[PDB]
Amino acid sequence: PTINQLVRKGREKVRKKSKVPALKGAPFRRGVCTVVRTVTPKKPNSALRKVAKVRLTSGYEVTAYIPGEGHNLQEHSVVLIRGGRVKDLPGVRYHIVRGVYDAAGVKDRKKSRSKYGTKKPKEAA
Amino acid sequence: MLTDPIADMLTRIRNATRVYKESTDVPASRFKEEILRILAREGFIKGYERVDVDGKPYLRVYLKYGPRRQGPDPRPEQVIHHIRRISKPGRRVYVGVKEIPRVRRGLGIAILSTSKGVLTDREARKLGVGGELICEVW
RNA sequence: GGCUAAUCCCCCAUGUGGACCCGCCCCUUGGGGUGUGUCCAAAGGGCUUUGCCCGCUUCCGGAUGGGCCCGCGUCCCAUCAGCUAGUUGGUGGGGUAAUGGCCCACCAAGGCGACGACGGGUAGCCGGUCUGAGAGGAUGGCCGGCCACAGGGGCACUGAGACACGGGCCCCACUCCUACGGGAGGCAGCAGUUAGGAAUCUUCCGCAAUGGGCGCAAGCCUGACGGAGCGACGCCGCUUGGAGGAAGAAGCCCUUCGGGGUGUAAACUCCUGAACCCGGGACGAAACCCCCGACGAGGGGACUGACGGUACCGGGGUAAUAGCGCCGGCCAACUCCGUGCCAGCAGCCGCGGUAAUACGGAGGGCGCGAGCGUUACCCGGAUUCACUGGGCGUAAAGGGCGUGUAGGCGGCCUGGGGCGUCCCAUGUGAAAGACCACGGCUCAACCGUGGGGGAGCGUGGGAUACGCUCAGGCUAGACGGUGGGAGAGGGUGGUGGAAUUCCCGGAGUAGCGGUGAAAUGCGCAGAUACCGGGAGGAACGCCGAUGGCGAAGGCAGCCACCUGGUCCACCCGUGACGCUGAGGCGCGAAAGCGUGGGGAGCAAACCGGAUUAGAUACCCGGGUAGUCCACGCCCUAAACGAUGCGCGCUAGGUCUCUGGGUCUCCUGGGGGCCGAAGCUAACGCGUUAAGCGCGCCGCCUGGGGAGUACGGCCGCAAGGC
RNA sequence: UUCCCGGGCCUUGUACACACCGCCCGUCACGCCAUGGGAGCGGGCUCUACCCGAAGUCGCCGGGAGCCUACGGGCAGGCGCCGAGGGUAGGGCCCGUGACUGGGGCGAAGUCGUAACAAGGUAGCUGUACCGGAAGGUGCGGCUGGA
RNA sequence: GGAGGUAAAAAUGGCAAA
Ligand SMILES: NC[C@@H]1O[C@H](O[C@H]2[C@@H](O)[C@H](O[C@@H]3[C@@H](O)[C@H](N)C[C@H](N)[C@H]3O[C@H]3O[C@H](CO)[C@@H](O)[C@H](O)[C@H]3N)O[C@@H]2CO)[C@H](N)[C@@H](O)[C@@H]1O
Ligand SMILES: [Mg+2]
Ligand SMILES: [Mg+2]
Ligand SMILES: [Mg+2]
Ligand SMILES: [Mg+2]
Ligand SMILES: [Mg+2]
Ligand SMILES: [Mg+2]
Ligand SMILES: [Mg+2]
Ligand SMILES: [Mg+2]
Ligand SMILES: [Mg+2]
Ligand SMILES: [Mg+2]
Ligand SMILES: [Mg+2]
Ligand SMILES: [Mg+2]
Ligand SMILES: [Mg+2]
Ligand SMILES: [Mg+2]
Ligand SMILES: [Mg+2]
Ligand SMILES: [Mg+2]
Ligand SMILES: [Mg+2]
Ligand SMILES: [Mg+2]
Ligand SMILES: [Mg+2]
Ligand SMILES: [Mg+2]
Ligand SMILES: [Mg+2]
Ligand SMILES: [Mg+2]
Ligand SMILES: [Mg+2]
Ligand SMILES: [Mg+2]
Ligand SMILES: [Mg+2]
Ligand SMILES: [Mg+2]
Ligand SMILES: [Mg+2]
Ligand SMILES: [Mg+2]
Ligand SMILES: [Mg+2]
Ligand SMILES: [Mg+2]
Ligand SMILES: [Mg+2]
Ligand SMILES: [Mg+2]
Ligand SMILES: [Mg+2]
Ligand SMILES: [Mg+2]
Ligand SMILES: [Mg+2]
Ligand SMILES: [Mg+2]
Ligand SMILES: [Mg+2]
Ligand SMILES: [Mg+2]
Ligand SMILES: [Mg+2]
Ligand SMILES: [Mg+2]
Ligand SMILES: [Mg+2]
Ligand SMILES: [Mg+2]
Ligand SMILES: [Mg+2]
Ligand SMILES: [Mg+2]
Ligand SMILES: [Mg+2]
Ligand SMILES: [Mg+2]
Ligand SMILES: [Mg+2]
Ligand SMILES: [Mg+2]
Ligand SMILES: [Mg+2]
Ligand SMILES: [Mg+2]
Ligand SMILES: [Mg+2]
Ligand SMILES: [Mg+2]
Ligand SMILES: [Mg+2]
Ligand SMILES: [Mg+2]
Ligand SMILES: [Mg+2]
Ligand SMILES: [Mg+2]
Ligand SMILES: [Mg+2]
Ligand SMILES: [Mg+2]
């Protein structure tokens, strides 16, 4: 546009929107599960992904993904929301930190145990 | 209506160099006459003269171009590779002696009107004045 | 109730001086001086004592700190467009150290706002910090400057200064003590408790230092501070050895089984030596104090350390923690096994459905290392808000079109000012940080010293090319005159013929319409086809075109009236009068709405007949609004050249419309085609640019949701913006 | 050589490219979620008018009534204006909720049709109006993004 | 010889993937 049009109107800042409404953008958020289940993903894939409706401290109720293989989550389980969505599950935008307050780590995990919360096993080595 | 008579001159020059014309006609102005005085000393033209067209004074700016290259596309290289107005009437550009640009690492010229007259970048830093940055030619 | 002392309170005096009224003078907003009148002062204490010291009083001056005012700058929402009663201004008062509607009476009716008032959301601001090539974007944590607060809210008192965190009063909420009647309290100080939360410390030591308060001093107080303690929270420094070591053990992994990999890794051999143990042991400390000199200058002596026996120095002396991410591409690092669209991975594209370098494990590899990954946020990449530095024919995007307010911009010459702009000098731009050198901790992080500068703004002086302004002038822009030209430009009024349908008369008969094939339908009640006559509405064949006109929508028989735009010539006048144009205003196809008229043909909806699996459609036969007229509304479009307007420049060739000429041909305007250069992503554009420029306006910022919902305006509604 | 099937070349159209045994549109059934409307309900903030109104400054009295150290004065006390807030009454914006409802987005293999892309078998799109289970058909005018 | 311009037929193809 012209210079005079830019003195009058100006330039609009983009001001990006959040993809994580965790109420003040905290890194984590404690929440209790309400309904834990399995759903079906989008069209290119097909499996039974474990999901969980979590009643967080902020008053809302959001679906959360359980990572790894196997868990110990129930109707009265306390979890910790991490963030990050699942591409194949529409409606799932958060993740559950394993290894905290009620969600035990992936049993018999050996490689990437920083994620999925599993301690260092000690077999004389 | 000629909102800017200076850019019409520089565009008449630019339009006459792409067709390799001998000369072109720009209207008369004592300020454009001083701008063309700088284009002649630095070597972008041959000169001008206060001609008269139907009782109206114009300026026959004689052009100048490079050697006739061989091979494909035999048109010669331009002596004016680039010319454009900076301080347009919509946005007047005013500069000082510290903020003078290095037009093509000194291989170009920066004409700018000062209180000491129509000078250029190398003459502005020598006298120490600066002013309205008119145009860049290279 | 009663004594009682002072640096407590008061009265009288003295008045250098000061305050106030009035007059005069200088200046010139209440600054300074002067004269008359009036008013105002005050404290004592200690010693080597009729001599100093600490204090007191009044006035002037310095230095510091602060009050008020002004210029400029300071987030988003216009789906917030009007706001204003102490509101705006004056007069006189009150109040304050001091102006002011700060407050009060009276008068005048003003003040602010698209340069965004008012309102709504959010936020303490800065020096700086983070990023970035830069411009900018984001931020205000530690430190420093200013502010605002002290459970929420109001208020004053004392005082140089407070509307006062650890002072007072009152109201509310809450906690606590009660003899129940009326009392106590305010950790957003230092620690600490609880709550909330993903998450954030020790109820530590000391006034040794520096700083603050009091005091002549001695000294007292300081959770200010100096330090210690917790936490990989960040950065920096360091350790888990080092040199040897077999053509190369065991174990494990792969194997085309011949071998290769881990792997000079290990064991082993030398060597040094974290930790640890012993002894010593700080800098930070020198003043205040005392003595000589006069308790001055100068000189001399002594006291004092939390950290801390700590860093550190010397001697001795042990082989002494390694972990995390990744290995499809981006992206550095590959093989075996399991699993079989299961379990699962995932930042993007995407892997997995029997042999997966993408899941899980193992081997091996890569990357970093007391760290490594993840999640959230900021900048970057993002030149995807483009000032540097983007765009709109077809990808997102030119307003349907004009006229025009403000605004932005504006031709040639010569003068005056010097506002923009430019230079020089000066002042400011605190420190810290950052940057460059040199130092101090054994380096670095950290810290000290010095140096260097931005911009911005105030003052003085200069320059006058460009922008602005004032004045004079000029004609190339623009407008006007004179004479003519073409056109479906617009409105009104009248009018011509062909044809369709209907009615009437004559004539005449067994079928007519209709499909792409047939029915419905019409017709012996006399149809179709033919002649004559009449009514009525609508549209104007040939001319007619790839044509003309208008800003667009759009405009076609003919006549006349009213009327607009435009073109050429003559070069006569005005003389820069210009271009664009947010808002507004007006026009705006078709369909649609209201009110009345009209209704021949056509024809949404509707009903038949066919087709069809079905037909709410395509085809056929009927047919109502509508189409048409008058006025008022509606305001849309593939309102398209999907190209806003104005001016200047840049090769031509050819067809056509319309003027002018000394009319072979030239030149002005307009409608087409092909194409120099050039542009473009390509198609294509190309003097009627999508080229090269400049001015102004509208618009764009991934798709769906959506031109939707809410709010606002408009409308009779439909619906529009 | 008109017509069925297959093939060759040229050209044209394409939304097809695991390529017409292609693609693709809407209604319906199911599930998840977000949003609008909705008899209304609950909450925050804010505004206008009024009633009462502590502390306290200031203004008047200071007397049929006190205290006083210099008394045509002071203090106590009393009155009035202002006043934190409380109360009542009507509004304004915003947030949350609500039986039910409208359309929407998403979710591998459900039903019904064949609208579009090839003259897509009725050239398509488009503005408006009417109708129809639905994509959609028809009317009037327009467009070339068609012959 | 330049405009005008010649349909009677007919629905569909489960999902994802070199
Ligand atoms: N997606 C946009 C919207 O989709 C609408 O379509 C929606 C429905 O019409 C459509 O339903 C389709 C159906 O058309 C088709 N005939 C069968 C198909 N199985 C259905 O599919 C749907 O349902 C199944 C479960 O039943 C879901 O797993 C699947 O994800 C979903 N697409 O699924 C769509 C939503 O996924 C319309 N096309 C239109 O309004 C609009 O374009
Ligand atoms: Mg005197
Ligand atoms: Mg006296
Ligand atoms: Mg705040
Ligand atoms: Mg950049
Ligand atoms: Mg508190
Ligand atoms: Mg006082
Ligand atoms: Mg205090
Ligand atoms: Mg306190
Ligand atoms: Mg907690
Ligand atoms: Mg101290
Ligand atoms: Mg001290
Ligand atoms: Mg081995
Ligand atoms: Mg010492
Ligand atoms: Mg690689
Ligand atoms: Mg396998
Ligand atoms: Mg991977
Ligand atoms: Mg693997
Ligand atoms: Mg950027
Ligand atoms: Mg980014
Ligand atoms: Mg830009
Ligand atoms: Mg772009
Ligand atoms: Mg487009
Ligand atoms: Mg104007
Ligand atoms: Mg000018
Ligand atoms: Mg000036
Ligand atoms: Mg500084
Ligand atoms: Mg420094
Ligand atoms: Mg003349
Ligand atoms: Mg003039
Ligand atoms: Mg105009
Ligand atoms: Mg209309
Ligand atoms: Mg109409
Ligand atoms: Mg009508
Ligand atoms: Mg009526
Ligand atoms: Mg009919
Ligand atoms: Mg059929
Ligand atoms: Mg019909
Ligand atoms: Mg068109
Ligand atoms: Mg325009
Ligand atoms: Mg247009
Ligand atoms: Mg032409
Ligand atoms: Mg062409
Ligand atoms: Mg609409
Ligand atoms: Mg052949
Ligand atoms: Mg073909
Ligand atoms: Mg609702
Ligand atoms: Mg008296
Ligand atoms: Mg509600
Ligand atoms: Mg709903
Ligand atoms: Mg079809
Ligand atoms: Mg069709
Ligand atoms: Mg169709
Ligand atoms: Mg239509
Ligand atoms: Mg129909
Ligand atoms: Mg079907
Ligand atoms: Mg098919
Ligand atoms: Mg299929
Ligand atoms: Mg699949």
Tab-separated table of N, CA, C and O (backbone and C1' of nucleotides) in Angstrom, chain C residues 240-258:
chain	number	residue	atom	x	y	z
C	240	U	P	40.323	-37.681	36.523
C	240	U	O5'	39.230	-38.781	36.858
C	240	U	C5'	39.395	-39.631	37.979
C	240	U	C4'	38.183	-40.491	38.212
C	240	U	C3'	37.822	-41.433	37.083
C	240	U	O3'	38.562	-42.634	37.144
C	240	U	C1'	35.880	-40.313	37.874
C	241	G	P	38.807	-43.495	35.826
C	241	G	O5'	40.365	-43.398	35.603
C	241	G	C5'	40.868	-42.832	34.413
C	241	G	C4'	41.596	-41.551	34.681
C	241	G	C3'	42.866	-41.387	33.871
C	241	G	O3'	42.649	-40.754	32.627
C	241	G	C1'	43.376	-41.184	36.143
C	242	G	P	42.988	-41.531	31.271
C	242	G	O5'	44.512	-41.178	31.015
C	242	G	C5'	45.037	-39.904	31.355
C	242	G	C4'	46.522	-39.957	31.556
C	242	G	C3'	47.251	-40.926	30.656
C	242	G	O3'	47.514	-40.402	29.372
C	242	G	C1'	47.939	-41.257	32.870
C	243	A	P	47.448	-41.350	28.087
C	243	A	O5'	48.836	-42.097	28.115
C	243	A	C5'	50.036	-41.354	28.066
C	243	A	C4'	51.231	-42.234	28.287
C	243	A	C3'	51.224	-43.544	27.528
C	243	A	O3'	51.608	-43.426	26.175
C	243	A	C1'	51.737	-43.972	29.762
C	244	G	P	51.174	-44.572	25.151
C	244	G	O5'	52.301	-45.665	25.327
C	244	G	C5'	52.005	-47.036	25.155
C	244	G	C4'	52.820	-47.904	26.077
C	244	G	C3'	52.610	-49.393	25.891
C	244	G	O3'	53.411	-49.919	24.856
C	244	G	C1'	52.367	-48.865	28.166
C	245	G	P	52.735	-50.641	23.608
C	245	G	O5'	51.715	-51.651	24.266
C	245	G	C5'	52.166	-52.918	24.695
C	245	G	C4'	51.017	-53.825	25.023
C	245	G	C3'	49.794	-53.730	24.115
C	245	G	O3'	49.789	-54.342	22.826
C	245	G	C1'	49.089	-53.493	26.317
C	246	A	P	50.849	-55.390	22.235
C	246	A	O5'	50.488	-56.784	22.885
C	246	A	C5'	51.259	-57.927	22.546
C	246	A	C4'	50.427	-58.998	21.892
C	246	A	C3'	49.997	-58.740	20.455
C	246	A	O3'	50.991	-59.090	19.502
C	246	A	C1'	48.133	-59.422	21.740
C	247	A	P	51.147	-58.261	18.135
C	247	A	O5'	49.859	-58.649	17.295
C	247	A	C5'	49.798	-59.898	16.625
C	247	A	C4'	48.390	-60.278	16.253
C	247	A	C3'	48.305	-61.477	15.310
C	247	A	O3'	47.382	-62.514	15.702
C	247	A	C1'	47.304	-59.547	14.306
C	248	G	P	45.923	-62.311	16.345
C	248	G	O5'	46.179	-62.027	17.879
C	248	G	C5'	45.192	-62.388	18.826
C	248	G	C4'	44.770	-61.215	19.668
C	248	G	C3'	43.279	-60.917	19.723
C	248	G	O3'	42.627	-61.700	20.707
C	248	G	C1'	44.546	-58.912	19.481
C	249	A	P	41.027	-61.849	20.784
C	249	A	O5'	40.826	-62.609	22.160
C	249	A	C5'	41.648	-63.721	22.458
C	249	A	C4'	41.477	-64.221	23.867
C	249	A	C3'	40.062	-64.459	24.339
C	249	A	O3'	39.554	-65.697	23.890
C	249	A	C1'	41.294	-63.354	26.019
C	250	A	P	38.075	-65.802	23.302
C	250	A	O5'	37.151	-65.846	24.588
C	250	A	C5'	37.416	-66.753	25.642
C	250	A	C4'	36.738	-66.306	26.903
C	250	A	C3'	35.275	-65.959	26.746
C	250	A	O3'	34.446	-67.093	26.749
C	250	A	C1'	36.344	-64.263	27.970
C	251	G	P	33.315	-67.220	25.636
C	251	G	O5'	32.233	-66.168	26.101
C	251	G	C5'	31.603	-66.305	27.356
C	251	G	C4'	30.873	-65.050	27.716
C	251	G	C3'	29.881	-64.574	26.677
C	251	G	O3'	28.632	-65.222	26.799
C	251	G	C1'	31.254	-62.773	27.331
C	252	C	P	27.904	-65.813	25.506
C	252	C	O5'	27.319	-64.533	24.786
C	252	C	C5'	26.332	-63.754	25.427
C	252	C	C4'	26.280	-62.362	24.860
C	252	C	C3'	25.946	-62.261	23.389
C	252	C	O3'	24.556	-62.322	23.156
C	252	C	C1'	27.789	-60.866	23.898
C	253	C	P	23.991	-63.042	21.848
C	253	C	O5'	24.311	-62.008	20.696
C	253	C	C5'	23.684	-60.743	20.712
C	253	C	C4'	24.138	-59.887	19.570
C	253	C	C3'	24.129	-60.549	18.211
C	253	C	O3'	22.841	-60.595	17.637
C	253	C	C1'	26.139	-59.359	18.507
C	254	C	P	22.446	-61.785	16.648
C	254	C	O5'	23.351	-61.544	15.371
C	254	C	C5'	23.011	-60.509	14.471
C	254	C	C4'	24.059	-60.269	13.423
C	254	C	C3'	24.318	-61.393	12.441
C	254	C	O3'	23.351	-61.444	11.410
C	254	C	C1'	26.368	-60.469	13.177
C	255	U	P	22.810	-62.848	10.866
C	255	U	O5'	24.047	-63.450	10.081
C	255	U	C5'	24.559	-62.799	8.933
C	255	U	C4'	25.933	-63.302	8.569
C	255	U	C3'	26.030	-64.768	8.211
C	255	U	O3'	25.613	-65.009	6.889
C	255	U	C1'	27.832	-64.159	9.618
C	256	U	P	24.942	-66.399	6.507
C	256	U	O5'	25.949	-67.015	5.442
C	256	U	C5'	25.509	-67.409	4.153
C	256	U	C4'	26.517	-67.056	3.088
C	256	U	C3'	27.980	-67.297	3.420
C	256	U	O3'	28.367	-68.642	3.184
C	256	U	C1'	27.689	-65.195	2.316
C	257	C	P	28.578	-69.679	4.388
C	257	C	O5'	30.141	-69.674	4.654
C	257	C	C5'	30.738	-70.677	5.454
C	257	C	C4'	31.174	-70.140	6.793
C	257	C	C3'	31.702	-71.164	7.784
C	257	C	O3'	33.089	-71.380	7.585
C	257	C	C1'	30.284	-69.539	8.849
C	258	G	P	33.834	-72.729	8.036
C	258	G	O5'	35.369	-72.313	8.006
C	258	G	C5'	35.828	-71.152	8.691
C	258	G	C4'	36.570	-70.220	7.767
C	258	G	C3'	36.840	-68.817	8.288
C	258	G	O3'	38.048	-68.737	9.014
C	258	G	C1'	36.006	-68.742	6.062
